[PDB]
Every structure is written in C-alpha cells, then in structure tokens.
Curated annotation (Swiss-Prot), chain A:
The gene is RPS6. GO terms for cellular component: cytosolic ribosome; nucleolus; ribonucleoprotein complex. This is Small ribosomal subunit protein eS6. Ribosomal protein S6 is the major substrate of protein kinases in eukaryote ribosomes. The phosphorylation is stimulated by growth factors, tumor promoting agents, and mitogens. It is dephosphorylated at growth arrest. Component of the 40S small ribosomal subunit. Plays an important role in controlling cell growth and proliferation through the selective translation of particular classes of mRNA. Part of the small subunit (SSU) processome, first precursor of the small eukaryotic ribosomal subunit. GO terms for biological process: translation. Its main location: cytoplasm. The chain holds residues 51 to 200 of 249 of the full protein. GO terms for molecular function: structural constituent of ribosome. It is found in: Cytoplasm; Nucleus, Nucleolus. Component of the small ribosomal subunit. Part of the small subunit (SSU) processome, composed of more than 70 proteins and the RNA chaperone small nucleolar RNA (snoRNA) U3. Belongs to the eukaryotic ribosomal protein eS6 family. The modification Phosphoserine is found at residue 98.
UniProtKB/Swiss-Prot annotation, chain B:
The modification Citrulline is found at residue 22. The modification Phosphoserine is found at residues 67, 110. InterPro entries: NA-bd_OB-fold (IPR012340), Ribosomal_uS17 (IPR000266), Ribosomal_uS17_arc/euk (IPR028333), Ribosomal_uS17_CS (IPR019979), Ribosomal_uS17_N (IPR032440). It comes from Oryctolagus cuniculus (Rabbit). GO terms for biological process: translation. The keyword ATP-binding does not apply. This is Small ribosomal subunit protein uS17. It comes from the Eukaryota. Citrullinated by PADI4. The modification N-acetylalanine is found at residue 2.
From Swiss-Prot, chain C:
The modification N6-acetyllysine is found at residue 233. It comes from the Eukaryota. It is found in: Cytoplasm; Nucleus, Nucleolus. Its main location: cytoplasm. GO terms for biological process: translation. This is Small ribosomal subunit protein eS4. Residues 42-104 form the S4 RNA-binding domain. GO terms for cellular component: cytosolic ribosome; cytosolic small ribosomal subunit; nucleolus. Pfam families: 40S_S4_C, KOW, Ribosomal_S4e, RS4NT. There is a cross-link at residue 230 (Glycyl lysine isopeptide (Lys-Gly) (interchain with G-Cter in SUMO2)). Component of the small ribosomal subunit. Part of the small subunit (SSU) processome, composed of more than 70 proteins and the RNA chaperone small nucleolar RNA (snoRNA) U3. Identified in a IGF2BP1-dependent mRNP granule complex containing untranslated mRNAs. One of its GO terms (molecular function) is rRNA binding.
Curated annotation (Swiss-Prot), chain D:
Component of the small ribosomal subunit. Identified in a IGF2BP1-dependent mRNP granule complex containing untranslated mRNAs. Part of the small subunit (SSU) processome, composed of more than 70 proteins and the RNA chaperone small nucleolar RNA (snoRNA) U3. The modification Phosphoserine is found at residue 159. Belongs to the eukaryotic ribosomal protein eS8 family. It is found in: Cytoplasm; Membrane; Nucleus, Nucleolus. It comes from Oryctolagus cuniculus. PANTHER family: 40S RIBOSOMAL PROTEIN S8 (PTHR10394). This is Small ribosomal subunit protein eS8. GO terms for cellular component: cytosolic ribosome; membrane; nucleolus; ribonucleoprotein complex. It is a lipid-anchor. The modification Phosphothreonine is found at residue 129.
Length: 150, 158, 263, 206
RNA sequence: GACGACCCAUUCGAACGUCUGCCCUAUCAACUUUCGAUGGUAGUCGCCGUGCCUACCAUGGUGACCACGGGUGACGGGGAAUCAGGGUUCGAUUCCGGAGAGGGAGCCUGAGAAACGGCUACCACAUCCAAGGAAGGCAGCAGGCGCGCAAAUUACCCACUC
RNA sequence: GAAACUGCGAAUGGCUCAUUAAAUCAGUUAUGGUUCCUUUGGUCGCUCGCUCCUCUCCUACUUGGAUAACUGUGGUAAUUC
C-alpha cells in the first residue's frame, strides 16, 4: 500500500487533493501537514496532490501482504514491540481474565538492562483500577447528598 | 373604533383573548373586548378618554409597552404635521461669564403623542418624560397636556 | 487601551482613605473581586504594613497568609489581597487579637480592637428581597450573603445580626425613627446620630435627616445610612471619637491642652 | 462584515459625520435564516457571551394550540397562505413570525371526539359505525352519562371553525421566531382575526 | 481538602440611551430623500432598545437663536504661564477617557479582540533563493539611516513596587 | 525528574497623537432595553422514568478507542517546514 511521500522541493502529499498540481490550501488543527503555534491559528501552506508521477523524490510503501520469499534486509530481521498496556481493561482483554480475578501481577515487567548498580524491572501505573480510596470518594459523595436533603 | 384596521395586518392589544363560552346576548351586548390600561404612577393620572376609547397603539404608555422612568421635562407645541407624533421646543437661556449677559437658545425635539389626546392645538403647553427609544428621533412620550398661559384657546367664561 | 477588563490600578488613581504615599512606585495593590466595592474596601495587605506594620514588603505577606493565621468573617483566607470592607471581623488567633473595620469621624478605616466574644457575629444591612423558586424567599446583603427563610417582617434598610459559625440570623433591628445610625458614604462619614425624621420623594434619591447628641442637624442620602442599634443604645461597640465631628479649631485646642505628642 | 452599525447614517439636519471607529464584533449582521418547510436542518451558531443560538432551516412541525378549550398538540405545518410583511415571501414559501399557515387538524378532532363525545363535520356516518364508533359509544355503567353531561352545552363550536375540519386544514398563526429559537410554535386563529385574514386571502389571490 | 459543572445573587466591568456645555469662516444660505431623508405598520437581524436592515404606506425633518458647506501646525478633560479687578494665551506630554499599530478589507479563537509580539487577501515597500519557492512590519526598550534650528546607554537587575 | 498532552494567561501593560468639531470628552442621569471570565454567598436525588430488548444478572468494585513524548526510517537550496 502506498501511504504517500514527498514531492521535489519537499512538498508533502496528503489525501483528498486530486491531480498533481501544487495547491495552497487553508489548514488548521485536525488536518494533515499543520502544526499550530497558537490556538485557532490558520495558515495557508502549499502541498501537492495524490496522483503519482515521476516528479516525486521518495514514496513510502507499506508491506501489507507477505510473499513466498523473504527479502534479506527487512523481513528476516525480527524486532519485538516494546510496551504492554498501561490501562486496566486492556490487561483484562489481553490475558483474558474474568471480572473477578483481581489484577495485580499480570503487568508487563520492563527490564532496565544496566545502570552500573543493578538492573530494575519497571512497570507502568494502572488507570481505572478500583482501590479502597476510590470507594471512599463515592461514599462521601452520597453522604453529602443525604445531608443536603435533611 | 368599528374600523381601526387599514393595515395589511390585524391590530389588537396583547394580553387579551377571545373566549367562545356561552351564547345568549339578544340583539347585541358585550363588544367581545375588555379594555386594557394601567397606572403610570408619579402623580400622573390616566385619562378617562383612554379607557373609554378604542385605539391600538403600542408606543403610548397608557395602553402599550413603554415605561416612564428617569427624567421628566416640559416644553411647548410648535408644530404638528406628522402621524402619531408632534414636534416641540425648549426655550432657555445660556450664560457667558466674561460678560454678565444671557442670550436665547432653543432646541427642537420630536416626541410621540397618544391617539388619546386629540384636543391638542399649536401653542399648548405639553409635559413629557424620559422613556426607552421608540424611533430614531423619539425618546419620549407625553404624560399630560395643559393650557395655563396668556391668550388662551377659548374665551374666558370657564 | 481597553478591549477587555483591566488588572492594574495605580497609586494616584487609588482612593485616599488607604492613605497611600507617592514615593513608592507607580502601582497600588488593587483589590480583587469579592463582596465589597473598591471605593469601600480596605485591601488586606494595606492592613498589614501600612497600618499595623508586622510586614514590611509584599513578599512577607505572601509568606504569612499561606500559614493560615489569618481569617476573615470566621473563614480562612490565604491571598495577598482580599476586599474586606465595613463591618467585617479579622481574627488572628495566634496573637489572640480581633479587629473590626469601622469608620473614624475623619472617614477612614481605623483599628477598633474588640473582645473575641464580640467577634462571633457582625451587623448586616438588607438591600433586596427576592422570591426564589417554589415559594421560598431570599435576602441580599452588602456583604453579599444570601440567607434563606428570614422572618416575614424584615424589609430593606433594616439590619440583621448574623452568626458567622452557622449563618441563619438570630435577631434583627427594624428601621424606625429615633434609632441610632452610622453613615457609610458621602460627605458626612463616620457620624453617629439618631434618625429624627425621614423624607420621601417618588422617584429616586430620597434623603434622611440625622441629629446627634451634640445638637447638630445634617442630612445625607438614604443609601449611605446603616443602622447600628436602637435610640442612643448601639448594639455594637463604638471607637473613640464617637461621631462628634469636631471643627478644626477645637481639635487644635485639645492637642495643646494635653500637650500630647510624647508619653 | 455585513454590519449593524449606527455610526453611519445622516443626522436630522441632513448632515454627515466623517468616519470614526472601525467596525466591531458587537455590531454585526450575519445573513438571514430564510427558513422554508421541508425536512429538519438545524445549525448551531456560537453567539456573544456564549449561550448558543439555534437557527432552524426547513421545519415541518410546530406546536400550535387551541386555547378556547386549552389543548395544544404537535401538528404538521403544510403550506403558507398569507405573509403580512411581504407578498414575495409567500411565493417562495418562507416561514417567519406572524405568518398564516395550514395544518393537518388531526389531533384536535381526536381530542374533541373523546372529550366532548361528538364528531365534527363528516362526509358520511357509514365510516364511523364499524370503528370510530367504538370510542364514541361506550360501555361504562356509570360514566357513560355522568362525565359527558358536564361537557354538554360547552361545545357549540362556531361556524367558521366547523367548516374547516371537513377540508382537513385550519389556519393558525406563527408566534415564534424560527431563526432565533430553533422551533416553530403558534396559536390557532379564532374570532375576528379569522374573519379578517379570509378576506385578505380572497382579495389578493383568486 | 483539590478540581469540575447548572442556575440565582454579588464584584470587576462592558454596551447603548437622557439633559447641558465648542475654535475660525457667509468671497459657504438654503440643506436632506428610494443610492432611507423624517414618520407609521409588520418582519428579519442583534446581547438588547432602535430605519440597524427589508417590505408596504405617508411627506416629512433642519435653518439668520447660523443650519448646510469649508478650514484647523484641532485628540478631549483634570490642568499650565501671565495676572489689582475683569481677562488673555497654551494643554503632543507621567492621572482619567478615546483612537491607531505601513495603507485598506475580511476573519479565526475566546467570557472579552474585528487583535496585528493572531491569521488571510489586495495595494505601497523591502529580504533570502540552487529561481522550484520561502519569509517580514521597532508609533515596545536600546540602536541606525534620513529629516531638520532641534533632543541620551545596542548599560546593570527582579531587591523594592505590582 | 527533562520532554509531551491538558488547564490558564497572552484582550493587561508599554507606545504614539495620524484620524476625529455635538464627534471625542466633562458634569448629570438610565437599563423596568441588555451582556458579564472571575471572586464571594446560596443552588446540588425522577425529576419516580432504567422506559433497554439480549428476553431479562444489567460495567457501576469504574465503561469505549486514539495521539504525543518515546523508538526507528526519511524528503527539501532553505523555514519555530
């Protein structure tokens, strides 16, 4: 799959900009090829179309379907992904835990290889995990409501 | 009164409804219209003529929406040649402190006049009062009309 | 300049009853928004280094207020500026001191120390009565407290005693002739005297005559009057001076009589 | 851009005043709604101080009322007939305050039939007898008559009203700004208004 | 305790509106109107009142008590210099109000801006470039050129005042 | 605890006097014609409806899925690209 690339003179390619001319579009937050330096800011930069020609410097091709053969410099090389989830419910979906099992030891442990001291194993901090502290804030939340009515 | 429409729209007072309750008057009776009016306060009195009569005007304070609040002033009639309004004048004296003399200056103002008053003539004293804007050059309405000055409108035997 | 609201007030723009100098720099404190109006406020920091002189710089007040020794109206405040005004109580509990903000006959906020027992309440004028939703009433006061369910005979220009601890007023005074009043604004300021007479005009800017116990009659607008207690009997403690409003000649005579500028 | 200034325009004496301050955001226009009748399209417009303002384009329902016996039901808005501000607006079917429009007239009959226990104008009684008589006749013992007796002689319904049900349309008055509110609403014509606007309609067209 | 949210009140205001107050000029005496001038009726729009705008209808409004037009090395006021009394002359300029950021117009964000230490376009300028393109607005503090009779350091520092 | 997302401020100040003759502005009045971040004080359980459709165990002991920093590969003579 071709995901775009860079025209000569560095002009980038975005989607929905049919033909190959170099057009100056209004751009703002939530569009390709824009960085705001102030909120609500709108600039009018030049970009270049979708339709491929030989006027382009470089293209980005993403491997989608893998063939019979293995290209030597890429698909033979194997690199694992780094990080497990940081959120509660992603750990539940991943290792396929029940609602009742109390996650507390199903986190990925990320090694610190060296530091000249000792190796650490790091973990992230779970979010949306119920603890006793959570329930207090919800119990005091309702206590005030009843107190108000009285 | 029986004709008060000449517009491309119907004219009526707000805060009035026409009921369809009961049926028996015989020949005639209730004109199917109670009248709306209100007090103005500040020692000014609603005319009898307003409560008696029939007109639809929203810019008079005896019927329509518009308050009198803030200032109160007087003037005198100078001209009438416009519909539901008049022109008036304010004579006054401007002083100069280099001299010890005064001098005459006048301004002219328009102001709206109710269909309630219809006994106005050019030369009557008039009273007015501050209001919210009604029009570009109208900011006021009449509260009262009077004559109590030299060379009166009709012969002395009153 | 303006396109939105301003955030500076200079020295020389600022009022004269804070008694500012002119050889510290261009800016003055400016009270931040609150229940009192800035031509009736005494900002907090002006009480702490331009009156009592505990602090010496504004940075010192920032180190003091954070410690939470300061209260205002029995609650805790913790900022350089707060807009306390007429009839509020400051309370430092570490020193065991309590102040009250009230007017000299000169017309400026003095030091009126008081017992801690007195500092458990303040006197509040009623300004507006407003029926809320579902047949519930409200009060509105100059210190901007909304006290629900008042007694149904209390009306504006009365005054009410509020318990800072629980709100919910215990008692009140009714506006009547011959009751004792204090002035809170206008040319006459800080004078104490009984009501004597009222005058009404349909319209606005009704006035209220006053007479004191020195045999002088003066008048002021209605909305600068504040009630303090029944005739010749304040329900508050009073400072020295006591609304006499001496002429300048008599004030000269006192100073050269006691010969007082040394102790 | 398009503005609602006041520092233009001549004074009373025919004088002109030379250009003063540049246009500002609190003196501002923003083009007209020009709402029609069709499927609901609503746009939400940010306005000064916050507090969003709804602009309605192509409504087709409004809440009219029949305050004579005090029922108000939701009914479809069919077509414009009379627009007392301009003639051109009727031709392009533009909907604004104090127009005169047409409705289906359906729930008002249903309410009348159940409450006053009588039908309005009808083509034939043949339709009624198998079903729609089931409501009108009733099996109550005890409160066939006892309720309905109090409804009697409070249902004379006027001549100009009754004839209109047969056409299946009724003339009601828009008493809302659709471009500011986001809703059409109104009251149905009664009395002398309903005599008036008939005469204007027959005068102008036909 | 901390934070957030709906409404009411309050505070800081904001925006329109009332009455009175103005320098020179008639070799400027009639002015304003369907390119709305003045008013009536209805509607649109707007935070709201309002010819603000639109439709329909009326013919008004202003002036020798100086309108209308033209001029101003005219920002306004609190004030300043001189001075017996009465005045005359000045007020760019430390406080308050206003207007504007090269000239015009449009607009985004926000409670608040028609913002320029935000943006888009035209016009007048001026900069870089591999000639494909890209970037800019000192009436902020210093500093330079120019202009003229005529006016300071590309300094030190958030300790004071805020 | 760098970085990065998020909230808030950047409409205050500073500067200039070009425009501007009932305009600006000053005194006086008006919102009962309106808007108002923020502070301060009150407002904090229908409202009676879980009404879904899966045919009733229902995530309320807490629901849903992406972006930056980061890791790695780049383009342009040049940009807070």
């Amino acid at each position: 799959r071709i995901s775009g690339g860079n025209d000569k003179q560095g002009f980038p390619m975005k989607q929905g900009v049919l033909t190959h001319g170099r057009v100056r579009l209004l751009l703002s937050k939530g569009h390709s090829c824009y960085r705001p330096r102030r909120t609500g800011e709108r600039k009018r930069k030049s970009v270049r179309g979708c339709i491929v020609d030989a006027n382009l410097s470089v293209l980005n091709l993403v491997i989608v379907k893998k063939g019979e053969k293995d290209i030597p410099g890429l698909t033979d090389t194997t690199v694992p992904r780094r990080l497990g989830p940081k959120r509660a419910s992603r750990i539940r979906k991943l290792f396929n835990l029940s609602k009742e099992d109390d996650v507390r030891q199903y986190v990925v442990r990320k090694p610190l290889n060296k530091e000249g001291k000792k190796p650490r194993t790091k973990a992230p901090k779970i979010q949306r995990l119920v603890t006793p502290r959570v329930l207090q804030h919800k119990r005091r939340r309702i206590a005030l409501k009843k107190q108000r009515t009285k | 009164m029986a004709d008060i429409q000449t517009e491309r729209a119907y004219q009526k007072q707000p805060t009035i409804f026409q009921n369809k309750k009961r049926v028996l008057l015989g020949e005639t009776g209730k004109e199917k219209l109670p009248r709306y009016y209100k007090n103005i306060g500040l020692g000014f009195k609603t005319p009898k003529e307003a409560i008696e009569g029939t007109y639809i005007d929203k810019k008079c304070p005896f019927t329509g929406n518009v308050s009198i609040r803030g200032r109160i002033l007087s003037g005198v009639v100078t001209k009438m040649k416009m519909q539901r309004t008049i022109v008036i004048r304010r004579d006054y004296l401007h002083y100069i402190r280099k001299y010890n003399r005064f001098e005459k200056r006048h301004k002219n103002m328009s102001v709206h006049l109710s269909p309630c008053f219809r006994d106005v003539q050019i030369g009557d004293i008039v009273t007015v009062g501050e209001c919210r804007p009604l029009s570009k050059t109208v900011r006021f309405n009449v509260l009262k009309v009077t004559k109590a000055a030299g060379t009166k409108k009709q012969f002395q035997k009153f | 300049m303006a396109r939105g609201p301003k955030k500076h007030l200079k020295r020389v723009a600022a009022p004269k009853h804070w008694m500012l100098d002119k050889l510290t720099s261009v800016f003055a404190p400016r009270p931040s928004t609150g229940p009192h109006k800035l031509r009736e406020c005494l900002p907090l920091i002006i009480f702490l280094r331009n009156k009592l002189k505990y602090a010496l710089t504004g940075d010192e007040v920032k180190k003091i207020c954070m410690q939470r020794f300061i209260k205002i109206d029995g609650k805790v405040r913790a900022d350089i500026t707060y807009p306390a005004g007429f009839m509020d109580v400051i309370s430092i509990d570490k020193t065991g001191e309590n102040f009250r903000l009230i007017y000299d006959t000169k017309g400026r906020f003095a030091v009126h120390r008081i017992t801690p027992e007195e500092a458990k309440y303040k006197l509040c004028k009623v300004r507006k009565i407003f029926v809320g939703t579902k047949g519930i009433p409200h009060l509105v006061t100059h210190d901007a407290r909304t006290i629900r369910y008042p007694d149904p005979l209390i009306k504006m220009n009365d005054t009410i005693q509020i318990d800072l601890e629980t709100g919910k007023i215990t008692d009140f005074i009714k506006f009547d002739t011959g009751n004792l009043c204090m002035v809170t604004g206008g040319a006459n300021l800080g004078r104490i005297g009984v009501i004597t007479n009222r005058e009404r005009h349909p319209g606005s800017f009704d006035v209220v005559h006053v007479k004191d116990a020195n045999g002088n009659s003066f008048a002021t607008r209605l909305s600068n009057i504040f009630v303090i207690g029944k005739g010749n009997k304040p329900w508050i403690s009073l400072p020295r001076g006591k609304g006499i409003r001496l002429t300048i000649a008599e004030e000269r005579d006192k100073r050269l009589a006691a010969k007082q500028s040394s102790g | 851009g398009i503005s609602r200034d006041n520092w233009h325009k001549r004074r009373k004496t025919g004088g002109k005043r030379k250009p003063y301050h540049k246009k500002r955001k609190y003196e501002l226009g923003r083009p007209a709604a020009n709402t029609k009748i069709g499927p609901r399209r609503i746009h939400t417009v940010g306005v000064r101080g916050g507090n969003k303002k709804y602009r309605a384009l192509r409504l087709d329902v409004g809440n009219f009322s029949w305050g004579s016996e005090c029922c108000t039901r939701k009914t479809r808005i069919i077509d414009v007939v009379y627009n007392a501000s301009n003639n051109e607006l009727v031709r392009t079917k533009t909907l604004v305050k104090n127009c005169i429009v047409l409705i289906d007239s359906t729930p008002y009959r249903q309410w009348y039939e159940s409450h006053y226990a009588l039908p309005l104008g009808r083509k034939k009684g043949a339709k009624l007898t198998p079903e729609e008589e089931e409501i009108l006749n009733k099996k109550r013992s005890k409160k066939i008559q006892k309720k309905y007796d109090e409804r009697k002689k409070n249902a004379k319904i006027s001549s100009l009203l009754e004839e209109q049900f047969q056409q299946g349309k009724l003339l009601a008055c828009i008493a809302s700004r659709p471009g500011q509110c986001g809703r059409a609403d109104g009251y149905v014509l009664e009395g002398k208004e309903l005599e008036f606007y008939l005469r204007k309609i027959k005068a102008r067209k036909g």
